[model samples]
Target: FTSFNDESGENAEKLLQFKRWFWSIVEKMSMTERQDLVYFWTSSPPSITIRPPDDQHLPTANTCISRLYVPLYSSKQILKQKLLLAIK
Candidate 1:
């Protein structure tokens, strides 16, 4: 199996760039959605958080999916709350 060069300066730079881009997207999300994304990554929930063997692709995909989902999820929650209010 191929492995990433863990000690290369170029690799480090790329990782840093990815992280910056990831956090930029995170900061754009709503507070609750942003918090949820952080918890999912840091708390090590199943395959949601990246680990060895899948680290490279998983984190990238996870970040993209989270970024895409935040707005959708926030809209869904807001709609649900509004519907509940209307029913009351």
Candidate 2:
């Protein structure tokens, strides 16, 4: 629910694409699904943290602070797919 910082060493343009694509998806997420994300992460809403994918693939959460960890995927499609996979 915010802007971003480079969590990994992804290309600048790649990260920018991710920033736009990410919030675009999130902005469209049903309120219920957003709630689900909050709940799944830590049973709450928040200013979440973001980091580049660890080895280019992971969608995990740091429950201690609700940071969502993910990869700098090659396309928006996979980002959505992987993100959904994380909280699925």
Candidate 3:
């Protein structure tokens, strides 16, 4: 679900920030909990998929496809919060 996209210009900074927020959660993840992440992965930041930043629409992922569909969170901390909930 990744490998090709238009995250090359203005989207670049946002994308990198997304990585920071996403991985930051992972950085502190215990190896055991990290294993849960792996289980959810297709075996994959998952080349994040952008969506509207709405509280009603939390992040979603497809274990079979290895893609993370998430909202365009207002802040890095916000994204982290949502992702933690999703993975949990």
Ranking by TM-score: 2, 3, 1
Which structure among the candidates has the greatest TM-score? 2
Candidate 1 per-residue C-alpha lDDT over 1-88 given as tens digits, one digit per residue, 9 for 90 to 100:
1122232233445545443444455456676664555555343232222122222122222443432111111223343333223222
- Residue 50, model 3: lDDT of 68
Candidate 2: which stretches are off by over 4 Å?
A: 1-3, 45-56
lDDT of each: 0.34, 0.69, 0.64
- For every candidate in turn, the CA RMSD to the true structure comes to 13.5, 2.7, 4.1
lDDT for model 1 comes to 0.34
For model 2 the TM-score comes to: 0.75
Candidate 3: list runs displaced more than 4 Å. Answer: 1-11, 43-46
Worst 10 residues of 1 by lDDT: 67-76
lDDT of 3 at 21: 72
Segments in model 1 whose C-alpha atoms lie over 4 Å from true places: 1-10, 41-88
TM-score between model 3 and native:
0.65
Give the per-residue lDDT of model 2 (tens digit) for 23-59: 7877788887788777777756644445655435757
TM-scores for candidates 1 onward, in order: 0.34, 0.75, 0.65
Model 1 TM-score on a 0 to 1 scale: 0.34
